Amino acid sequence: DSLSKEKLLTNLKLQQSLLKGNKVLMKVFQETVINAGLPPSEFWSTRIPLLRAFALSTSQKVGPYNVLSTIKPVNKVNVNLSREKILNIFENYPIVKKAYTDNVPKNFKEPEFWARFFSSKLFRKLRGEKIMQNDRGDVIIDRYLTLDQEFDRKDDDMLLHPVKKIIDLDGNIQDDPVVRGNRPDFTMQPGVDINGNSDGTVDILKGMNRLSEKMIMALKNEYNDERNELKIDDLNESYKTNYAIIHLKRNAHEKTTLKVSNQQMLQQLSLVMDNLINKLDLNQVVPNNEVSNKINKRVITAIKINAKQAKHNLEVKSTLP
């Protein structure tokens, strides 16, 4: 894809996009690629992550979500829309896009279309709302109602597919095809009206069902099994780590570019013991005034060097213009 070294080095449009915005990078490019003569290809060789990071920012999209449910009209009612939301409506509801592309540039402007769409029955049908015959709807959008019904049939086929026998409820009712018992009470069947026709509540239930199926199928875009699921994992052998161990043997050569005997050590150890037991004078520690000056001079010699270095150990003030 467009996230590799080869393609990013060749994507000149992207290379211009980030350089246009970035200032410090732009300054360097101007001095080194325009007047100095450095090839453009080599300049971007060492800045691959910068190019990739800039592309990923605009190359990612939000996930599918019910857009019309979040839309609350809030006599006049003001409903706030956004460009991102408008694109989302087109993606989640292809019928809305169909009515949009064929009318916006030909008959009426975009703002009129959205005002009509919200006041139409399609916006109530697309939403999981029971259509009321009392509602007037909108003339333009109401025509597409039949088209949406046809699209729903197409969507049902686009989603229909064989299901694993583990969760295949169709076969359970067909296990015995000759079951002739008592018909279930009206509580276990879809609601009906006086005339015996449907009330329309199952339609909205399927509508939300269809929306969820479409959203999940969108995730799995271009971008045996039952054996593992039916097994009890808790009864299996606990996971065992396969980490590696290292025994570090430490032995290295010594760094490269008068020994006394035990008798001498004992004599010196006796001498220090004899000096300590006899008497210890702390006053003799004072120097003789001939080495004290030398000692101070040596120490001050290092202080001056350290003080000079430590005095100058946001850019520092410069004397140049």
Partner: peptide, 21 residues
């Protein structure tokens, strides 16, 4: 002024497009 910095880049990139094309 930044406008010349972008214009010279745009001219250079336009020259780059003209040169490559």
């Amino acid at each position: 002024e930044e406008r010349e910095n972008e214009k010279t880049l745009n001219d250079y990139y336009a020259a780059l497009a003209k040169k490559q094309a």
